[PDB]
Every structure is written in structure tokens, then in C-alpha cells.
Specification:
It is classed as signaling protein, transferase. Chain A is an alpha+beta fold and 340 residues long. Helices cover 33% and strands 13% of the residues of chain A. The chains are: A alpha+beta (340), B mainly alpha (20). The interface between A and B is medium-sized, with 31 and 14 residues. The complex binds adenosine-5'-diphosphate (ADP). Adenosine-5'-diphosphate binds next to strand 1 and strand 5 of chain A. Adenosine-5'-diphosphate (ADP) binds next to strand 1 and strand 5 of chain A.
Chain lengths: 340, 20
């Protein structure tokens, strides 16, 4: 019975691996697209909603300036993003439709999800009911079990990176810091409020930090605010290490117990790491109502169904200065991204 | 109230990953 899931990952790891050892590469070109708007603009990031020319399909094209990625020492990570991204496949994993590059940029043509960054919707609602926090949570539990099975580590779990597709389910994005390792790593990456203590103290860490961020995420969904916060990141890091949590009057004694384990400084006791595995999470009382297979198939009534105004410029979001994307007449950083 | 203190702060908008 549970051999289904035991026999599922196998099939998926084989599927994953084959793609990870023989990456897909340069599978479309800029000109085969028409830029529609700029959905964001980062220090090196950038997401320009586009429409595929030959088919009228819309994609969220992510554009990374080559020279910046390097300056920010994000080469390995940027390559980690593409490589892991073209191999994985999961219901809650935004699909990278196309990839390619030119003289000045690297392009990752992501699937466009017209639902709504869970952030805005969360800050708008204030906080999600436990039942609802559970709904999204569950999907994360599963998506990690998928990722982790492939020796993958997300490292950037937070509402922001969670999109709510039209059916009301989640699609994870932003794999900038995802990496495939079996030992333990050391880079300092993630978002202040979601960093496990072993990252802050830079001890060296594993997939355990992902189960920590879940706690933080679950807590921030149910509370309405992160379990650890302040003005400057230096402080955040402090509140975290001291490791003392306080729950809201309205938290079920069941949420707190679960959260008391996810947000656990002690690696030998925290859920997700221990021998029994993801079942100390999956089998917790707070997840009693949850039917794990119901969700994978997505046969569950979503709590919130975004009023999406169809494909493209539905409505709202926010406007940025439509910066042109230039392609130098010279190739920039050839050897570096050769495998991109 | 913890909620207001949160709201009063500046880390209530879209947060940026660290890696400068
Ligand atoms: N595949 C996608 N479909 C729809 N919207 C997306 C997609 N990818 C990114 N976005 C939107 O574009 C924005 C890009 O801004 P950005 O700061 O780069 O996000 P982040 O750095 O958190 O990954 C996101 O906040 C989100 O609203």
C-alpha cells in the first residue's frame, strides 16, 4: 500500500536522474517571443511576462543578466537553478518550459501561473485559518518529500515563493538556492526569517533546514506574522538562535506541538530529519484531517480560488519601468555558462 | 500587540533572500 509511494519515487528518481545527467539546453530563442510586461525587477533577477509567438501561449520569462550573476558570485547557484529545474517534475513545481541564452543574458522560460503570490493574499487576509494553513502546508510537505528524495535542498521557502494557481493549489518557484548534495553544505542563503539556526551559526547543514522553514512558514500562515522578526536582519538572527517561540492565543494545541518540533534547534529531535522520516510530520495530529493522496491528485476542494481574469494582463499586480533587454554584439561569459 | 508591532516594522513587504 505505502509501497505505492515507495515505488513512486524510484520511478521518479530514474526519471529525474536521466535528465540531471543529460540536461536539456538552448531550446528556444528570444525572437520567438513578444515581451508583455515586467512582473518584477531584482538585484540580478527579472521576470517579464511574455506571449509565445507561434502558439499564443503565455510564459513567465525569467531574464538574468550574465555579468550581474557573476558579480554577485551566483554562477554555481545560477547553474544549479537551471540544472535542477529542467529535471524535476511535480504537481506543485512550476514547470520550466524553455531555456536558452545569448550574448548578454540567460533565459529560463517559466510556466506562467495566474493565481497570486500567496504573500499578498496572506497579508491581505491577515492570516489563514488552521484548516487552510494545513491545505497549502500539506502540498509543501509533499513537494519536499519529492525534492529531498532527489537529494535536493530548496533553501528559500517562504510565502513569496509560493504561487496559488487557478485551481487554488500551490506552485513553488524561485529555485535560485536549490542544490543537489548528499553531504552537508555551508553557503549562507535563504531569507532571514526562514533560516534554521545551523545556517546562521554556519555549522554546515542538510535537508533539515527545509523542514525548519516549513515550521516558520506554517507559523507565519496561521499567525499572520513570522515566528521571528525585527527591523534589521541582525536581530532576526538573534531571536532565532535564542530559540524561544511564543504562540498566539488562537493556536490549536495540535499546531503548537507540531510547530514545537519543526522549529527545533536540536537536529536529533526535529521532524523530517529523524529516522521515521517525513511520517513524523505526515502523521502528526495537526495533519489528521489531511488525506495525502487526495492532494497529490489534487482531488481536494481548495479553500481560496483566485478570481483570475484569464490569460495575461488580468488585473492589478504592480508596474515597473519597462527596461529594454539588450544583447551585446559580443558574447559575455562564454566559458562560465557553457553548460547553461 | 505582537500583530501591530509586526505591522509597524518594515519587514512586512516582499522579503529579499540574502546573498549580496
Ligand atoms: N512563473 C510565474 N508565474 C507567475 N508569476 C510569476 C512567476 N514567476 C515569478 N512571478 C512573479 O514575478 C515576481 C518576480 O519578482 P521576484 O522578486 O524576482 O520574485 P522572487 O525573487 O521572490 O522569486 C514574483 O514576485 C511573482 O509575483
Amino acid at each position: 500500500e505505502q509501497e505505492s509511494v515507495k515505488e513512486f519515487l524510484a520511478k521518479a528518481k530514474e526519471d529525474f536522474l536521466k535528465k540531471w545527467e543529460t540536461p536539456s539546453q538552448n531550446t528556444a530563442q528570444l525572437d520567438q517571443f513578444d515581451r508583455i510586461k515586467t512582473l518584477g525587477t531584482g538585484s540580478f533577477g527579472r521576470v517579464m511576462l511574455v506571449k509565445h509567438k507561434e502558439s499564443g501561449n503565455h510564459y513567465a520569462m525569467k531574464i538574468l543578466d550574465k555579468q550581474k550573476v557573476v558579480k554577485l558570485k551566483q554562477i554555481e547557484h545560477t547553474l544549479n537553478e537551471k540544472r535542477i529545474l529542467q529535471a524535476v517534475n511535480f504537481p506543485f513545481l512550476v514547470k520550466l518550459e524553455f531555456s536558452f541564452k545569448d550574448n548578454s543574458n540567460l533565459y529560463m522560460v517559466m510556466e506562467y501561473v495566474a493565481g497570486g503570490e500567496m504573500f499578498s493574499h496572506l497579508r491581505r487576509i491577515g492570516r489563514f485559518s488552521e484548516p487552510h494553513a494545513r491545505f497549502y502546508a500539506a502540498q509543501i510537505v509533499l513537494t519536499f518529500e519529492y525534492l529531498h528524495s532527489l537529494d535536493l535542498i530548496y533553501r528559500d521557502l517562504k510565502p513569496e515563493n509560493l504561487l496559488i494557481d487557478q485551481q487554488g493549489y500551490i506552485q513553488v518557484t524561485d529555485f535560485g538556492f536549490a542544490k543537489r548534495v548528499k553531504g552537508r553544505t555551508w553557503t549562507l542563503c535563504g531569507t532571514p526569517e526562514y533560516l534554521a539556526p545551523e545556517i546562521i551559526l554556519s555549522k554546515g547543514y542538510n535537508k533539515a533546514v527545509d523542514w525548519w522553514a516549513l515550521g516558520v512558514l506554517i507559523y507565519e500562515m496561521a499567525a499572520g506574522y513570522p515566528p521571528f522578526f525585527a527591523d534589521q536582519p541582525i536581530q532576526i538572527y538573534e531571536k532565532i538562535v535564542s530559540g524561544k517561540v511564543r504562540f498566539p492565543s488562537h493556536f490549536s494545541s495540535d499546531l503548537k506541538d507540531l510547530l514545537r518540533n519543526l522549529l527545533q534547534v536540536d537536529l536529533t529531535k526535529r521532524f523530517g530529519n529523524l529516522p521515521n522520516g517525513v511520517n513524523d510530520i505526515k502523521n502528526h495530529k495537526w495533519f489528521a484531517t489531511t488525506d495525502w493522496i487526495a492532494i497529490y491528485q489534487r482531488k481536494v476542494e481548495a479553500p481560496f480560488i483566485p478570481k483570475f481574469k484569464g490569460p495575461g494582463d488580468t488585473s492589478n499586480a504592480d508596474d515597473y519601468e519597462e527596461e529594454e533587454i539588450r544583447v551585446s554584439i559580443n558574447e559575455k561569459c562564454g566559458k562560465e555558462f557553457t553548460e547553461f | 500587540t505582537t500583530y501591530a508591532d509586526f505591522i509597524a516594522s518594515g519587514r512586512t513587504g516582499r522579503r529579499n533572500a540574502i546573498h549580496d
